[PDB]
Design a protein around this motif. Structure first.
Motif, mmCIF file in Angstrom:
data_model
loop_
_atom_site.group_PDB
_atom_site.id
_atom_site.type_symbol
_atom_site.label_atom_id
_atom_site.label_comp_id
_atom_site.label_asym_id
_atom_site.label_seq_id
_atom_site.Cartn_x
_atom_site.Cartn_y
_atom_site.Cartn_z
ATOM 1 N N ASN A 93 -55.728 29.590 -1.636
ATOM 2 C CA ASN A 93 -55.332 29.363 -3.020
ATOM 3 C C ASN A 93 -53.819 29.436 -3.174
ATOM 4 N N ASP A 94 -53.182 30.401 -2.508
ATOM 5 C CA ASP A 94 -51.727 30.497 -2.565
ATOM 6 C C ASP A 94 -51.073 29.310 -1.870
ATOM 7 N N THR A 95 -51.597 28.915 -0.707
ATOM 8 C CA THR A 95 -51.025 27.790 0.023
ATOM 9 C C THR A 95 -51.175 26.494 -0.765
ATOM 10 N N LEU A 96 -52.372 26.245 -1.304
ATOM 11 C CA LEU A 96 -52.582 25.041 -2.100
ATOM 12 C C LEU A 96 -51.658 25.015 -3.309
ATOM 13 N N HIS A 97 -51.439 26.172 -3.937
ATOM 14 C CA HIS A 97 -50.538 26.229 -5.082
ATOM 15 C C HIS A 97 -49.113 25.873 -4.679
ATOM 16 N N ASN A 98 -48.685 26.311 -3.493
ATOM 17 C CA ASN A 98 -47.340 25.986 -3.030
ATOM 18 C C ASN A 98 -47.191 24.499 -2.739
ATOM 19 N N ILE A 99 -48.250 23.849 -2.253
ATOM 20 C CA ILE A 99 -48.204 22.404 -2.048
ATOM 21 C C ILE A 99 -47.930 21.698 -3.371
ATOM 22 N N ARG A 100 -48.672 22.071 -4.417
ATOM 23 C CA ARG A 100 -48.474 21.447 -5.720
ATOM 24 C C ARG A 100 -47.069 21.702 -6.247
ATOM 25 N N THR A 101 -46.515 22.885 -5.969
ATOM 26 C CA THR A 101 -45.144 23.170 -6.375
ATOM 27 C C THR A 101 -44.161 22.257 -5.653
ATOM 28 N N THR A 102 -44.354 22.065 -4.346
ATOM 29 C CA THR A 102 -43.506 21.142 -3.603
ATOM 30 C C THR A 102 -43.700 19.713 -4.095
ATOM 31 N N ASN A 103 -44.943 19.340 -4.415
ATOM 32 C CA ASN A 103 -45.202 18.006 -4.947
ATOM 33 C C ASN A 103 -44.381 17.746 -6.204
ATOM 34 N N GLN A 104 -44.287 18.740 -7.091
ATOM 35 C CA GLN A 104 -43.491 18.577 -8.304
ATOM 36 C C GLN A 104 -42.035 18.282 -7.971
ATOM 37 N N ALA A 105 -41.468 19.010 -7.006
ATOM 38 C CA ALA A 105 -40.075 18.789 -6.633
ATOM 39 C C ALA A 105 -39.874 17.417 -6.003
ATOM 40 N N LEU A 106 -40.861 16.930 -5.247
ATOM 41 C CA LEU A 106 -40.733 15.618 -4.627
ATOM 42 C C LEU A 106 -40.827 14.505 -5.665
ATOM 43 N N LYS A 107 -41.730 14.643 -6.640
ATOM 44 C CA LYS A 107 -41.805 13.661 -7.717
ATOM 45 C C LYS A 107 -40.470 13.545 -8.440
ATOM 46 N N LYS A 108 -39.803 14.676 -8.668
ATOM 47 C CA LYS A 108 -38.494 14.650 -9.310
ATOM 48 C C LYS A 108 -37.468 13.940 -8.437
ATOM 49 N N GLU A 109 -37.481 14.208 -7.129
ATOM 50 C CA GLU A 109 -36.518 13.569 -6.238
ATOM 51 C C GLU A 109 -36.738 12.062 -6.183
ATOM 52 N N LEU A 110 -37.997 11.627 -6.166
ATOM 53 C CA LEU A 110 -38.309 10.206 -6.198
ATOM 54 C C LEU A 110 -38.145 9.600 -7.585
ATOM 55 N N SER A 111 -37.972 10.423 -8.617
ATOM 56 C CA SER A 111 -37.759 9.937 -9.972
ATOM 57 C C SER A 111 -36.284 9.713 -10.292
ATOM 58 N N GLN A 112 -35.394 9.903 -9.325
ATOM 59 C CA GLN A 112 -33.991 9.554 -9.505
ATOM 60 C C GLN A 112 -33.882 8.036 -9.649
ATOM 61 N N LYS A 113 -32.649 7.531 -9.683
ATOM 62 C CA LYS A 113 -32.399 6.099 -9.726
ATOM 63 C C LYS A 113 -31.665 5.576 -8.501
ATOM 64 N N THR A 114 -31.137 6.453 -7.648
ATOM 65 C CA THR A 114 -30.411 6.029 -6.455
ATOM 66 C C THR A 114 -30.596 7.083 -5.377
ATOM 67 N N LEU A 115 -31.224 6.695 -4.270
ATOM 68 C CA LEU A 115 -31.432 7.592 -3.136
ATOM 69 C C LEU A 115 -30.169 7.598 -2.287
ATOM 70 N N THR A 116 -29.402 8.676 -2.375
ATOM 71 C CA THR A 116 -28.248 8.866 -1.507
ATOM 72 C C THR A 116 -28.769 9.257 -0.124
ATOM 73 N N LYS A 117 -27.856 9.569 0.795
ATOM 74 C CA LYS A 117 -28.270 10.145 2.068
ATOM 75 C C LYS A 117 -28.707 11.596 1.908
#
Lengths: 280, 119
Positions: free
Chosen positions: A10-34
């Motif tokens: 349950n703790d591990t699965l919760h951490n995956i969802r937390t990381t998923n949120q951060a990745l959605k934000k990173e992919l929600s930018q408008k320009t992928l730098t290096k």
């Protein structure tokens, strides 16, 4: 009531969802730098790390034949189709471990690499754009004309193709059947990729048609190495050139959206699995 | 047209876990013993695990006993290698293999998947 394996799941699965949120934000930018590809790789690595521990824990529940009650088994029917989920407790726990691990390796990370490969190609192309201003100078006899270093620009574009001739969108390693390559071709986009034979196998290479179009456009401008263009012939060339650049920008945007949407399907599975654990 | 597609290797920290996958097609899965081998750089190719009856635990080689386990899904024609408590010594090219008894004895190998354990 608590079981150490279920607590950590349950703790591990919760951490995956937390990381998923951060990745959605990173992919929600408008320009992928290096820095963007560095952030993606970080989140993807953290997902894989937690997915791999989840598999280990589910594997324990399988080999110890921990019961999955009828309630927990109904929640599992909410799993997305991409996860491919009256059989024994041992078998079902194992199929869940396989499911979460396989959707990461055979699905989510496929989109990730396609984004990383194309992003790098467009970044190297943007390095060529940075040098374009220095390849354009006034024409000697007319202030409304320009001189273009066609060969210098042509040289860079040809080397860009060489630099990515062996960096496919899919797969990151080895090869696949022609049929498998064509599956992911039609998935990623026929104008974004192109099936190619690597060595008896097949890959989905980066489709470099926009660069090829740029090169055919340069050749049609006239020879010598340098070329002088009146304002009209320059606006016409630059219009087509800017259109190709926007085609590549759009192609990248298409792969980022597919990657982002795949992460949501992955997130849906984790959500469903976590509800199942809360009822086991 | 026998095929053995492998998925799920890569980098891992010492003490971490990985679950390799081997998906098979082109033969009668019930007539095949499925194996995972590995080959470290400069060393010989050695057996890791081996399973036939999906209902049991198969057989695990000595250098990975108590750390690696193997499973089989006859519905999907797959075998998975659960690699736990990883060590840098486990670094190698892992490859699955099918031993097929069908009038003749034939065996096929996959392309292999790299596993690197390091901090």
């Amino acid at each position: 009531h608590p079981v150490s394996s279920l607590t950590m799941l349950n703790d591990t699965l919760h951490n995956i969802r937390t990381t998923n949120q951060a990745l959605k934000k990173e992919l929600s930018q408008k320009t992928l730098t290096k820095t963007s590809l560095e952030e993606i790789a970080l989140h993807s690595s953290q997902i894989s790390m937690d997915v791999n521990k989840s598999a280990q824990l589910l594997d324990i529940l399988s080999r110890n034949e921990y019961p999955i009650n009828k309630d927990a088994r109904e929640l599992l029917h909410s799993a997305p189709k991409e996860a491919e989920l009256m059989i024994s407790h041992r078998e079902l726990w194992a199929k869940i471990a396989n499911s979460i691990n396989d959707i990461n390796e055979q699905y989510l990370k496929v989109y990730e690499h396609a984004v990383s490969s194309y992003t790098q190609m467009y970044q190297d192309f943007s390095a060529v754009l940075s040098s374009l201003a220095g390849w354009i100078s006034p024409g000697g006899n007319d202030g409304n004309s320009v001189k273009l270093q066609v060969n210098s620009l042509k040289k860079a574009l040809e080397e860009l193709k060489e630099k990515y001739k062996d960096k496919p969108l899919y797969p990151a390693n080895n090869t696949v059947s022609q049929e498998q390559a064509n599956k992911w071709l039609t998935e990623l986009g026929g104008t974004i990729g192109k099936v190619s034979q690597k060595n008896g196998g097949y890959v989905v290479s980066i489709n470099m048609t926009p660069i090829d179009n740029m090169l055919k456009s340069l050749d049609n401008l006239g020879g010598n190495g340098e070329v002088v263009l009146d304002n009209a012939k320059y606006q016409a060339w630059n219009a087509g050139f800017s259109a190709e650049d926007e085609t590549m920008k759009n192609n990248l945007q298409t792969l980022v959206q597919k990657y982002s949407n795949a992460n949501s399907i992955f997130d849906n599975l984790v959500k469903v699995l976590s509800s199942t654990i809360s009822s086991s | 047209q026998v095929q053995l597609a492998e998925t799920g290797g890569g980098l891992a920290q010492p003490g971490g876990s990985l679950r390799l996958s081997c998906a098979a097609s082109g033969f009668t899965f019930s007539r095949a013993v499925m194996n995972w081998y590995r080959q470290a750089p400069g060393k010989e190719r050695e057996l890791v695990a081996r399973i036939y009856d999906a209902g049991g635990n198969g057989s695990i080689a000595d250098p990975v006993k108590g750390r690696f386990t193997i499973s089989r899904d006859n519905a999907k024609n797959t075998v998975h290698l659960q690699m736990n408590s990883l060590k840098p010594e486990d670094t190698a090219m892992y490859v699955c293999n099918a031993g097929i008894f069908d009038g003749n004895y034939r065996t096929y190998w996959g392309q292999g998947t790299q596993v690197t354990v390091s901090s």
